[PDB]
Amino acid sequence: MKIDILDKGFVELVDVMGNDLSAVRAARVSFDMGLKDEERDRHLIEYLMKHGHETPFEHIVFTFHVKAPIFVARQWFRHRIASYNELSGRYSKLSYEFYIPSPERLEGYKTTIPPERVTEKISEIVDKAYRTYLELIESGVPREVARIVLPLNLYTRFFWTVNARSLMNFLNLAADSHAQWEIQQYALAIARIFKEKCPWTFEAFLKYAYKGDILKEV
Amino acid sequence: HMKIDILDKGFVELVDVMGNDLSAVRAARVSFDMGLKDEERDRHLIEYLMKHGHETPFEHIVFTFHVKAPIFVARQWFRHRIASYNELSGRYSKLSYEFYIPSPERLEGYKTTIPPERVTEKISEIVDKAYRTYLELIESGVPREVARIVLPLNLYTRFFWTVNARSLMNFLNLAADSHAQWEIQQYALAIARIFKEKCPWTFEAFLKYAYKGDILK
Amino acid sequence: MKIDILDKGFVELVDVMGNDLSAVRAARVSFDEERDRHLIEYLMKHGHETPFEHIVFTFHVKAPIFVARQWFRHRIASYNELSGRYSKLSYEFYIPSPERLEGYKTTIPPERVTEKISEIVDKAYRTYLELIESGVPREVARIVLPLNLYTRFFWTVNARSLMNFLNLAADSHAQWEIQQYALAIARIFKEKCPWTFEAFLKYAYKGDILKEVQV
Amino acid sequence: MKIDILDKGFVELVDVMGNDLSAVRAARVSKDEERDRHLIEYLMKHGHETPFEHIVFTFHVKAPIFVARQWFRHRIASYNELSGRYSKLSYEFYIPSPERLEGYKTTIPPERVTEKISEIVDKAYRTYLELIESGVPREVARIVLPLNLYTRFFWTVNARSLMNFLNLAADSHAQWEIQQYALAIARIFKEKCPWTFEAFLKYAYKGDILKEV
Numbered sequence: 001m002k003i004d005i006l007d008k009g010f011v012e013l014v015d016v017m018g019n020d021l022s023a024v025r026a027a028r029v030s031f032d033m034g035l036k037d038e039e040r041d042r043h044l045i046e047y048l049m050k051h052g053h054e055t056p057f058e059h060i061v062f063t064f065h066v067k068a069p070i071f072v073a074r075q076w077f078r079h080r081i082a083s084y085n086e087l088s089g090r091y092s093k094l095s096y097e098f099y100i101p102s103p104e105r106l107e108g109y110k111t112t113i114p115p116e117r118v119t120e121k122i123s124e125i126v127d128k129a130y131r132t133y134l135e136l137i138e139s140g141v142p143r144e145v146a147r148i149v150l151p152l153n154l155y156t157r158f159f160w161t162v163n164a165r166s167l168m169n170f171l172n173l174a175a176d177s178h179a180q181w182e183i184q185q186y187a188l189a190i191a192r193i194f195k196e197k198c199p200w201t202f203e204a205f206l207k208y209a210y211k212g213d214i215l216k217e218v
Numbered sequence: 219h220m221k222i223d224i225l226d227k228g229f230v231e232l233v234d235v236m237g238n239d240l241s242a243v244r245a246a247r248v249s250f251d252m253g254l255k256d257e258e259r260d261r262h263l264i265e266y267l268m269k270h271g272h273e274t275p276f277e278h279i280v281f282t283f284h285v286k287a288p289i290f291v292a293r294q295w296f297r298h299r300i301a302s303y304n305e306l307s308g309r310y311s312k313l314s315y316e317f318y319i320p321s322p323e324r325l326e327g328y329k330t331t332i333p334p335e336r337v338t339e340k341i342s343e344i345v346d347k348a349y350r351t352y353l354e355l356i357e358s359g360v361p362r363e364v365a366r367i368v369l370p371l372n373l374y375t376r377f378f379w380t381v382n383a384r385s386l387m388n389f390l391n392l393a394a395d396s397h398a399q400w401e402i403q404q405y406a407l408a409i410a411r412i413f414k415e416k417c418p419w420t421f422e423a424f425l426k427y428a429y430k431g432d433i434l435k
Numbered sequence: 436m437k438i439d440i441l442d443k444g445f446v447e448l449v450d451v452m453g454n455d456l457s458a459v460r461a462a463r464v465s466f467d468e469e470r471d472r473h474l475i476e477y478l479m480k481h482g483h484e485t486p487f488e489h490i491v492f493t494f495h496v497k498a499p500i501f502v503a504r505q506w507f508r509h510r511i512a513s514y515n516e517l518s519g520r521y522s523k524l525s526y527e528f529y530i531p532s533p534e535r536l537e538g539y540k541t542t543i544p545p546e547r548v549t550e551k552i553s554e555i556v557d558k559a560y561r562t563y564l565e566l567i568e569s570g571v572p573r574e575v576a577r578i579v580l581p582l583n584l585y586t587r588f589f590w591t592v593n594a595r596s597l598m599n600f601l602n603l604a605a606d607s608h609a610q611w612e613i614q615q616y617a618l619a620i621a622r623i624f625k626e627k628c629p630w631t632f633e634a635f636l637k638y639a640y641k642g643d644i645l646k647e648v649q650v
Numbered sequence: 651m652k653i654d655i656l657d658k659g660f661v662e663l664v665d666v667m668g669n670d671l672s673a674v675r676a677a678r679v680s681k682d683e684e685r686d687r688h689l690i691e692y693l694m695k696h697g698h699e700t701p702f703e704h705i706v707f708t709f710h711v712k713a714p715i716f717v718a719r720q721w722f723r724h725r726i727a728s729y730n731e732l733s734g735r736y737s738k739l740s741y742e743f744y745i746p747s748p749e750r751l752e753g754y755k756t757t758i759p760p761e762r763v764t765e766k767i768s769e770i771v772d773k774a775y776r777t778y779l780e781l782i783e784s785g786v787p788r789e790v791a792r793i794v795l796p797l798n799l800y801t802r803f804f805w806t807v808n809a810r811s812l813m814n815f816l817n818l819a820a821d822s823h824a825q826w827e828i829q830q831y832a833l834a835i836a837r838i839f840k841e842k843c844p845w846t847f848e849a850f851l852k853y854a855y856k857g858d859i860l861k862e863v
């Protein structure tokens with residue numbers, strides 16, 4: 001399961017633990033009970049979601065593999081209730097891969113410069129920066145220093161392990177028009193995968209708990 | 219569902235697991251823009267990570283356990299905040315007649331003025347009386363959340379525990395150790411057995427390089 | 436600041452870092468009453484909660500074990516508690532007042548329920564002392580003690596996590612006993628962070644009882 | 651307390667809750683100097699770290715983004731940072747001194763490396779301002795800015811997590827730039843919590859640079 005994002009980004013599902021019934025099981029222990037049947041168990045998921053009983057959803061866990069620009073990753077990595085491992089500019093020579101916005105990204109803004117020219121100006125500056133980076137590397141400057149000239153639109157890659165409760169918090173905050181458009185796009189892909197693996201939890205989340213605006217439209 | 223019986227009526231049961239040793243290798247390798255290699259180099263990397271304290275890659279391995287334990291043991295266990303819990307409620311459920319009664323051998327090493335068998339019996343008596351009072355209060359219309367306050371700390375409870383391998387290693391350091399109470403040591407031994415089974419390379423490296431306790435040897 | 440709770444409990448404020456302006460400063464990233472108080476309301480009403488993490492409290496709490504077990508489920512906080520392994524425990528137990536059963540039709544008078552709870556704690560405690568006196572280690576002897584035994588702990592918590600605690604514990608769905616503790620925590624919070632507390636009540640608080648009971 | 655770091659950075663102490671005795675109080679659940687200091691050592695030596703969570707600091711830090719990205723990986727803490735979405739960003743970038751590289755054999759003089767870094771930041775910043783001036787929203791315009799751009803943040807952290815930070819950042823394996831920040835954090839920690847700091851160095855600190863300063 002892999003969804004392409006932006007010009008060179010992606011969100012890929014690496015692994016998952018549990019499913020909707022993992023949450024049902026965890027909730028039912030309060031009452032000294034276990035699973036029942038489809039109708040009552042699905043009903044329980046809705047009940048939990050509607051009354052803010054969120055801890056049972058911590059027992060569903062995902063691992064994603066994400067390729068995203070650094071400015072997006074910086075926003076994403078603010079979610080502390082999660083696990084991350086990322087590509088290092090200290091330890092790796094970084095690839096020529098940068099997020100160049102499409103002209104349509106500037107739709108809705110009156111600019112004194114054509115959108116195509118904005119695109120071009122972003123490209124020029126990344127090209128120069130990357131060339132400088134390689135030059136510094138070639139001349140013996142350690143990578144950890146050479147990379148400081150690279151722009152925030154450089155692509156990075158990381159593993160993200162997150163449980164369904166924290167993932168819902170992420171969707172609330174990132175699948176939302178107040179978040180930057182670029183991370184909205186990533187959050188939509190996260191939502192798609194979530195919905196696929198946990199359809200009852202996802203549906204109940206949208207119906208009762210989701211606070212953002214865009215998932216109910218798309 | 220691996221299941222290990224603990225104490226007189228307790229258990230630790232494995233409910234689910236995500237990932238394995240290679241999940242940690244994969245997560246660590248991304249720093250170098252790399253993925254998996256081969257058995258020798260990958261196993262070597264696990265040892266390397268363990269010996270240098272690079273622990274974040276082990277967070278991508280996750281377990282869900284189902285545990286039945288006495289409340290005094292659960293109170294110690296639930297101090298591990300880097301984990302997820304859901305537990306049986308004395309507010310919402312009528313609690314069962316199940317208590318941890320120590321065996322006489324539990325007092326081995328202690329000189330007691332009362333035979334160990336008699337200590338066992340005294341503990342039994344007091345739980346029996348407390349439980350009887352609990353039922354009586356319930357039967358008379360006292361809400362469960364109040365009636366249960368007379369029940370002793372050796373009452374068995376049950377919970378689900380979801381925990382990643384990093385936090386699980388911290389748990390083993392602290393609970394699989396002679397300074398911890400004997401009862402939780404027993405639970406920690408079972409958690410270690412399951413961990414070793416699911417993550418043999420991580421477990422072996424952990425024991426060699428990082429494990430701080432004294433009983434897992 | 437110390438507030439008595441239940442028959443022998445209390446919540447005591449031990450220390451605090453910061454005040455309403457600590458949140459303002461963090462939201463602004465810097466260093467009028469009207470503009471700063473307005474910002475606190477703004478943050479609260481839009482769910483910008485991270486700035487309130489820079490206000491921190493340390494409480495000292497004496498509470499029964501069943502209450503502490505509920506309280507200690509709040510993982511975004513710091514705790515240190517008295518030990519039954521390392522200390523001889525005191526004869527102190529929460530005995531409900533008869534009024535605790537008001538609203539419930541019991542086949543036994545409420546005063547008799549009170550008595551029955553007392554008896555059983557007295558017998559359990561006596562058994563505990565007998566076991567200790569006979570050479571049984573404390574960590575085993577204490578397992579016969581009931582859940583209403585008082586314990587004590589230090590609790591260090593920031594204002595964001597504290598607000599989550601008030602949402603869940605200062606609420607009629609929570610057990611009455613912990614509601615009482617939550618009311619005291621609210622009173623201290625309101626005293627130290629009046630603007631944050633007021634804004635919280637108006638815009639973010641999800642519970643029911645802090646709107647029903649003053650302070 | 652404010653310590654300058656790198657060419658334009660700093661670490662400033664904003665607030666603190668508690669002191670060494672806050673940890674002693676918590677471990678005891680309650681001043682005798684010798685016994686209380688001895689308890690701090692005892693806790694440190696046996697890995698009883700939770701009592702140090704009751705000491706808390708708030709710092710105000712100015713650092714380059716590549717340093718902040720490393721720092722912000724410490725999840726057991728609180729952060730609020732300047733936004734490139736909401737603010738026009740200032741012309742402030744970390745330009746390494748020539749001495750940062752002297753000790754690496756480079757085919758280009760260190761002074762020329764410095765100059766090449768400066769040129770590229772200057773061009774990037776100019777492009778940024780141009781895009782802003784032409785009506786491109788800030789959140790997009792800023793994506794051309796390099797990783798050595800300075801940012802500012804508040805950091806609230808307890809002594810236990812702060813010790814973990816010192817273990818990992820006040821250490822030669824960490825990038826030199828964040829080592830410099832960690833040294834300043836250590837200085838402020840030592841000043842406010844001398845007993846904890848001394849016991850930490852003696853029994854628990856795993857890094858290599860703080861015993862040399």
Ligand SMILES: Cc1cc2nc3c(=O)[nH]c(=O)nc-3n(C[C@H](O)[C@H](O)[C@H](O)COP(=O)(O)OP(=O)(O)OC[C@H]3O[C@@H](n4cnc5c(N)ncnc54)[C@H](O)[C@@H]3O)c2cc1C
Binds near residue numbers: 078081511736
């Ligand atoms: C539109 C928008 C604008 C933003 N602007 C800025 C900005 O200008 N500057 C900036 O610095 N950040 C900004 N952020 C980031 C924001 O402040 C949060 O850091 C981020 O959204 C992650 O949210 P979180 O803390 O809920 O998630 P997590 O860090 O994953 O925490 C999840 C939940 O756990 C709890 N939690 C975890 N750790 C703690 C703790 N230490 N104390 C108390 N509770 C805790 C909270 O209940 C939290 O909701 C912005 C975010 C959005 C969506």
Ligand SMILES: Cc1cc2nc3c(=O)[nH]c(=O)nc-3n(C[C@H](O)[C@H](O)[C@H](O)COP(=O)(O)OP(=O)(O)OC[C@H]3O[C@@H](n4cnc5c(N)ncnc54)[C@H](O)[C@@H]3O)c2cc1C
Binds near residue numbers: 399
């Ligand atoms: C022999 C023994 C005796 C004990 N005696 C007592 C006692 O008398 N009283 C008592 O109250 N407790 C006692 N404890 C419990 C102990 O203080 C810890 O609460 C418990 O061992 C959990 O450890 P932890 O904090 O490492 O685990 P977790 O809470 O799971 O944390 C895992 C790791 O995350 C980090 N972490 C998590 N949250 C925070 C935070 N808020 N700040 C900083 N770092 C954080 C730490 O690095 C920690 O190691 C005892 C434990 C043992 C083993």
Ligand SMILES: Cc1cc2nc3c(=O)[nH]c(=O)nc-3n(C[C@H](O)[C@H](O)[C@H](O)COP(=O)(O)OP(=O)(O)OC[C@H]3O[C@@H](n4cnc5c(N)ncnc54)[C@H](O)[C@@H]3O)c2cc1C
Binds near residue numbers: 610
């Ligand atoms: C009326 C009532 C009845 C209850 N009944 C039961 C019951 O029957 N059984 C039972 O076990 N518990 C029960 N609880 C406890 C409840 O499930 C929570 O454990 C408790 O209320 C603490 O809430 P919290 O998780 O938000 O707090 P904290 O644990 O302090 O966490 C604070 C916030 O940080 C985030 N967070 C922290 N850690 C994680 C994580 N690992 N993953 C995702 N997010 C995280 C969440 O956003 C959370 O809201 C009950 C609580 C109430 C109020």
Ligand SMILES: Cc1cc2nc3c(=O)[nH]c(=O)nc-3n(C[C@H](O)[C@H](O)[C@H](O)COP(=O)(O)OP(=O)(O)OC[C@H]3O[C@@H](n4cnc5c(N)ncnc54)[C@H](O)[C@@H]3O)c2cc1C
Binds near residue numbers: 818
């Ligand atoms: C020299 C060096 C090189 C590095 N290289 C890389 C790299 O190439 N790629 C990369 O991604 N990162 C890298 N890091 C970052 C590193 O992996 C850690 O993210 C960072 O050091 C913070 O450590 P922490 O998790 O101990 O701190 P915190 O995140 O503040 O956690 C504090 C403690 O709390 C506990 N804890 C908190 N959250 C959890 C959780 N979810 N599960 C289990 N335990 C938890 C642990 O006990 C931990 O030690 C590097 C760090 C160093 C020092």
Ligand SMILES: O=c1ccn([C@H]2C[C@H](O)[C@@H](COP(=O)(O)O)O2)c(=O)[nH]1
Binds near residue numbers: 071074
């Ligand atoms: O929408 C936002 C805005 C800010 N931040 C956090 C991320 C960075 O740590 C810091 C600055 O972000 P920018 O606004 O520059 O992207 O605040 C977010 O997480 N999301």
Ligand SMILES: O=c1ccn([C@H]2C[C@H](O)[C@@H](COP(=O)(O)O)O2)c(=O)[nH]1
Binds near residue numbers: 308309310501504505
């Ligand atoms: O109102 C509640 C009910 C339960 N729990 C948690 C605490 C325990 O870990 C477990 C059982 O508590 P009781 O329902 O028995 O109090 O669930 C709470 O935090 N609050």
Ligand SMILES: O=c1ccn([C@H]2C[C@H](O)[C@@H](COP(=O)(O)O)O2)c(=O)[nH]1
Binds near residue numbers: 294295399517519520
């Ligand atoms: O070995 C111990 C001793 C204490 N505690 C914690 C659990 C409780 O929160 C408190 C007291 O537990 P007892 O010492 O009573 O078991 O301190 C532990 O986690 N492990």
Ligand SMILES: O=c1ccn([C@H]2C[C@H](O)[C@@H](COP(=O)(O)O)O2)c(=O)[nH]1
Binds near residue numbers: 086824
């Ligand atoms: O010494 C390091 C190396 C890496 N990282 C983390 C920070 C980023 O999330 C990611 C890559 O950072 P760089 O190696 O590119 O600085 O790993 C650190 O925290 N410290």
